């Protein structure tokens, strides 16, 4: 009935588990490769992670909406407790809470206690200013966002691999006036 | 005074270090410059020889004292990727080193352990030097309190 | 500054204690995720493959060196947690025979990348040096048409970074068998070189 | 109820999928289908476009189960993204079924069947092959995005749910 | 084991009060300690086999294999041999050589950046007449360059251009610095009138303390 509830049950069924371990060690190996094959140029590689991450969540969201069946979110906080509550808990094993608003509610900051796409990772010292490395999710924070068409944009602040104390996202939305005619 | 290291397998060092006791400020006399990376090169040799062997002169990954050379008892350990632990043992006098294998084994181990902690870095490619300070805090409270 | 390839530091043992900034346990915490967000990973490691590669050898070759740096990390974490940290452990045998580290591939390395234990394990009756590691169903690639089989090879990929950083190096490839009801079947066929063999020759 | 000819379309163009499979017979697919896809890709916007005048509100629009197929995909009654849109259209030789997703993308099942609950039965069906195009297509890495489906697993993916059904 | 007693017997020979002529016996005792490593891994191991070997081989006196093992030990340049206190045995191993048959094209062709042929007019009344290129009238180019070594008395003499037309120079006796990128000051061509086909040119010969050596060409491309 709430969403908070029937997440852990589509997390029983038709969710077939994968160790995330393997899921951090191929994410290394590509971003390891990327850092690799750019010379050491580590502001190209936060773009082309996000244009995998587009990729990724532009055909993530017609498998999230197969799933589990939902209205539209009619109200910009009921897309972030339906990222904070079925989004990142059906595909991944995390719940993200939502702090931060913009006062005029365009901006919404989803607050990440732990990262588990980032477990046995440290940075090298000269990239320790210029690649966010879990960029990833960005991009999929576009691409499902946008095919919803809600025409956002989705960018760090900080991050606890960076020294900071905390990793969060910043999304806001630009305009949506287009939909399914039905 | 005891000089540590972990050789690659295409004989080349990630980690080097050397630890004294406080009595002799200055530590190993004229051997430190020459003598200590030409012996353990040397060991290297019958450290390669026994890795593959079955029955030694159990469990494969330590093993004991390899050689006794100019009074210096040299003791190796090899972990599963074929990292190699050669670490020398020195003294004005000749010196025990079985009687501390309840104890060096243990910090073989525990540095084994530091070694897989570096190696799971997906930015730490193998062949290269382990170039962190925290590694080198780890191992010297590891080197204090398994003297 | 610790360890540069230029000296070796002298310090005193039993000084005084330095700061503590970072430690994490080694052991694994029981974690899961969906399969449909490491298939799509999955899929667009392809797909960039895809798009930046000309022809299909040396695509194979890129994509077992990506399989190449997750087996060579590994190796050492699941054998130092199959001889499990600070509580007191004693380590495993290191084995060094051919046919025990298959054996471990296809009992430890199979059960901890999938929930599921390796199928079946055998030999080549034509020719020595030759061994098949064949599954029923590949979890990884079951959304990519039977077809082409280069993207089946980062699992194997996995396995000659497996078998080359542990001492006995060797090269892989895949092909699929369509036996039985299984339409796709997958075997893995291991070439070692002939450098080893004798090694195992000079040991009676 | 029973499905006999399996149609898949663009979100904005012409379709992608068409099967005439269970009809043992030969009849035209040739670029005809191209016509028909468009020409239901316009009628769906000119069909939601005209409004009777009822004003009122949902007081609704969700189905239930009836543990259609053969563990389902889902255990639970749903919702659906198409309020005020084309849902069948009935003849005398067959009765076609459309569902769409609210990504825009739609999905025609074309029923040999002749003359409330076609209705439910026809959106659990089509919402489980909108599950396995979302878990056998979009997945493909080979399979480019707004392109015709060229995937053979999908084939006996969807001709065993079909003869599931009957 | 090998290698640590040919090491120990070469550091036995070393110590030695004597004097002992030439013999063949240490030329394929030189060959094999360097072929004994894989030379042509550990690098400070390498250092200190070769640091020997040029000392054996000093005190032979065959002055062809100290310039050659310096000539070797130049590829281990930019890092474990520190800020010229062990560059400056490899100095007093180099200058009996380069005063000697030593005569090779200065150990590594990356010395020269990229140079601009500008020329500066100074009136407005007379500009480009005519009917990438450079379109040069009567002034004066540039060029500037460096080296990377820790060593100091790197000297240049005499830099000159290729086969092209009648651009020359003048004098160039000064020195360069040690690690940065001393600008070698004006040239001076006194171009000469010919056709107007164009046809770039790699790039200049710089002779350091010795005869005019070859090109070494321009950095990360031909820099045209």
């Known amino acids: 009935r709430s969403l908070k509830a029937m997440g852990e049950e589509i997390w029983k069924n038709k969710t077939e588990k994968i160790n995330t371990e393997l899921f951090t060690l191929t994410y290394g190996s590509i971003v390891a490769q990327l850092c690799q094959d750019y010379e050491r140029d580590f502001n190209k590689v936060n773009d082309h992670l996000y244009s995998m991450g587009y990729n990724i969540g532009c055909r993530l969201i017609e498998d999230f909406l197969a799933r589990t069946a939902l209205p539209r979110c009619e109200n910009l906080v009921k897309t972030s407790e339906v990222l904070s509550k079925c989004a990142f808990k059906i595909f991944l094993n995390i719940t993200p809470n939502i702090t931060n ?24 010292m000269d990239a320790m200013k210029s690649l966010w490395y879990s960029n990833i999710l960005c991009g999929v924070l576009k691409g499902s966002l946008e095919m919803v068409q809600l025409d956002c944009d989705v960018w760090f602040v900080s991050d606890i691999l960076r020294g900071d104390s905390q990793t969060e996202i910043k999304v806001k939305l630009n305009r949506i006036l287009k939909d399914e005619i039905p | 005074p005891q000089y540590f290291a972990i050789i690659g397998k295409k004989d080349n060092p990630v980690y080097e270090i050397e630890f004294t006791n406080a009595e002799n400020p200055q530590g190993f006399p004229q051997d430190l410059k020459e003598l200590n990376p030409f012996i353990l090169h040397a060991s290297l040799d019958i450290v390669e020889d026994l890795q593959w062997q079955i029955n030694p002169t159990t469990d494969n990954c330590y093993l004991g004292k390899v050689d006794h050379f100019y009074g210096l008892a040299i003791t190796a350990y090899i972990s599963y990727s074929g990292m190699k632990f050669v670490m020398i043992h020195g003294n004005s006098a000749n010196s ?20 897989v902690k570096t190696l799971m870095n997906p930015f730490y490619k193998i062949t290269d030097p382990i170039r962190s300070p925290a590694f080198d805090s780890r191992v010297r409270t590891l080197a204090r309190k398994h003297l | 500054t610790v360890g540069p390839k230029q000296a070796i530091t002298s310090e005193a043992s039993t000084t005084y204690i330095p700061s503590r900034i970072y430690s994490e346990s080694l052991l694994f915490k029981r974690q899961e995720a969906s399969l449909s967000a490491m298939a799509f990973l999955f899929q667009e490691m392809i797909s960039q493959l895809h798009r930046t590669c000309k022809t299909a050898g040396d695509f194979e070759t890129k994509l077992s060196d990506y399989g190449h740096n997750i087996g060579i990390r590994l190796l050492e974490l699941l054998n130092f947690r199959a001889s499990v940290s600070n509580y007191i452990t004693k380590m495993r045998r290191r084995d060094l025979k051919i046919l025990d580290i298959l054996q471990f591939i296809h009992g430890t390395l199979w059960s901890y990348l999938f929930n ?21 169903f590949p979890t990884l690639t079951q959304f990519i048409p039977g077809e082409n089989v280069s993207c089946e090879y980062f699992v194997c990929g996995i396995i000659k970074g497996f078998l080359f950083n542990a001492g006995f190096p060797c090269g892989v490839t895949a092909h699929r068998m369509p036996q039985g009801g299984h339409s796709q079947r997958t075997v893995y066929l291991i070439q070692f070189d002939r450098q080893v063999l004798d090694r195992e020759g000079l040991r009676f | 109820m029973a499905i006999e000819t399996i149609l898949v379309i663009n979100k904005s163009g012409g379709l992608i999928y068409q099967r005439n499979f269970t009809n043992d017979e030969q009849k035209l697919n040739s670029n005809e289908y191209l016509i028909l896809a468009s020409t239901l890709h316009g009628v769906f916007a000119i069909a939601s476009q005209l409004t009777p005048k009822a004003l009122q509100l949902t007081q609704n629009t969700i189905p239930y189960i009836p ?24 003849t005398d030789q067959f009765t076609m079924f459309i569902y769409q997703t609210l990504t825009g993308l739609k ?20 919402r489980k092959v909108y599950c396995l195009y979302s878990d056998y297509v979009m997945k493909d890495p080979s399979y480019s995005m707004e392109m015709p489906i060229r995937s053979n697993l999908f084939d006996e993916k969807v001709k065993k749910m079909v003869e599931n059904l009957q | 084991k090998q290698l640590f007693v040919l090491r120990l017997l070469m550091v036995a020979l070393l110590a030695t009060p004597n004097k002992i002529a030439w013999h063949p016996d240490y030329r394929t005792l030189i060959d094999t300690i360097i072929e004994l490593l894989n030379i042509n891994t550990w690098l400070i191991l390498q250092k200190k086999i070769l640091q020997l070997c040029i000392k054996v081989s000093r005190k032979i006196n065959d002055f062809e294999y100290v310039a050659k093992f310096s000539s070797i030990l130049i590829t281990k340049y930019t890092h474990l041999l520190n800020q010229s206190e062990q560059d400056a045995l490899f100095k007093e191993y180099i200058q009996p050589s380069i005063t000697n048959e030593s005569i090779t094209s200065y150990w590594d062709p990356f010395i020269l950046r990229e140079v601009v042929i500008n020329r500066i007019l100074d009136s407005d009344p007379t500009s480009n007449e005519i009917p990438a290129e450079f379109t040069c009238r009567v002034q004066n180019p540039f060029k500037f360059d460096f080296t990377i070594n820790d060593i100091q008395l790197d000297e240049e003499i005499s830099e000159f251009c290729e086969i092209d037309r009648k651009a020359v120079s003048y004098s160039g006796p000064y020195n360069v610095k040690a690690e940065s990128i001393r600008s070698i000051t004006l040239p001076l061509i006194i171009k000469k009138p010919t056709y107007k086909k164009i046809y770039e040119i790699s790039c200049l010969k710089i002779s350091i303390l010795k005869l005019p050596l070859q090109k070494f060409d321009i950095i990360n491309d031909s820099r045209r």
Request: glycine share 2%.
């Open chain 2, 96 to 115: 025990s080193v079985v009687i501390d294998d309840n104890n060096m084994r243990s910090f073989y181990q525990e540095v084994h352990e530091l070694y």
């Open chain 1, 101 to 124: 608003w913009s006062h005029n509610k365009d901006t919404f900051s989803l607050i990440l206690d732990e990262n588990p796409l980032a477990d046995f990772v440290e940075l090298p």
């Open chain 3, 116 to 136: 599921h234990v390796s199928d079946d394990l055998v030999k080549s009756s034509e020719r020595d040096n030759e061994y098949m590691i064949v599954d029923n």
């Open chain 4, 67 to 90: 543990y259609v197929g053969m563990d389902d995909f889902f255990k639970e009654p749903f919702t659906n993204w198409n309020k005020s849109g084309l849902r069948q259209l009935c």
């Open chain 4, 107 to 126: 999905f025609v099942a074309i029923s040999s069947s002749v003359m409330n609950l076609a209705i439910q039965i026809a959106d659990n069906f089509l």
